[PDB]
Design a protein around this ligand. Structure first.
Ligand SMILES: *[C@@H]1O[C@H](CO)[C@@H](O[C@@H]2O[C@H](CO)[C@@H](O)[C@H](O)[C@H]2NC(C)=O)[C@H](O)[C@H]1NC(C)=O
Ligand SMILES: *[C@@H]1O[C@H](CO)[C@@H](O)[C@H](O)[C@H]1NC(C)=O
Lengths: 48, 97
């Protein structure tokens, strides 16, 4: 009812928080991935 | 007949051309057709090994049927093209990346 705990000292604490802000920007070549060097495959993929 | 590429004893009547390296060419090695730059390769092939594959099961090294020389196959240079424009209202000049 009448007890209080009072700090008589202190600690200066340095902690780390690590936050991702960006990820790798990636580009994909449609034809070169689906039809690497097949011109016929590229022509077929044109329809899709 | 077994079609998976290997040292091919039996081949069709095709007249071989000269082997040209360090240039982007269409190539046909024992029925294996592709487009790329053929270059000298340091890969050491065992006698039964006639070509090499990468992690995508794409032929990245081949052995010449005549000279038994290992050749690395690199895709012909490619990339994206980006057009930097000030705006057609401002100007018709562009830059290409
Ligand atoms: C508050 O805490 C600090 C430590 O964080 C105390 O300083 C230490 O005191 C002891 C004994 O006097 C020394 O051996 C240490 O080297 C001191 N450390 C530093 C960083 O100075 C300080 O005495 C405490 N104060 C009170 C009033 O308790
Ligand atoms: C004081 O604390 C005791 C035990 O924690 C409790 O029984 C009592 O009721 C408290 N005082 C008052 C006035 O309530």
């Amino acid at each position: 009812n009448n007890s209080i705990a009072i700090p008589t000292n202190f600690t200066i604490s340095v902690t780390t928080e690590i936050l991702p802000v960006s990820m790798t920007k990636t580009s994909v070549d449609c034809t070169m991935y689906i039809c690497g060097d097949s011109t016929e495959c590229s022509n077929l993929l044109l329809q899709y | 007949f077994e079609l998976l590429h290997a040292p091919a004893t039996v081949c069709g009547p095709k007249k071989s051309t000269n082997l040209v390296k360090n240039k982007c060419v269409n190539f046909n090695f024992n029925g294996l057709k592709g487009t790329g730059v053929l270059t000298e390769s340091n890969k050491k092939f065992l006698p039964f090994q006639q070509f090499g594959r990468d992690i995508a099961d794409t032929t990245d090294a081949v052995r010449d049927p005549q000279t038994l020389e290992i050749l690395d196959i690199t895709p012909c240079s490619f990339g994206g093209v980006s057009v930097i424009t000030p705006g057609t209202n401002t100007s018709n000049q562009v830059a290409v990346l």
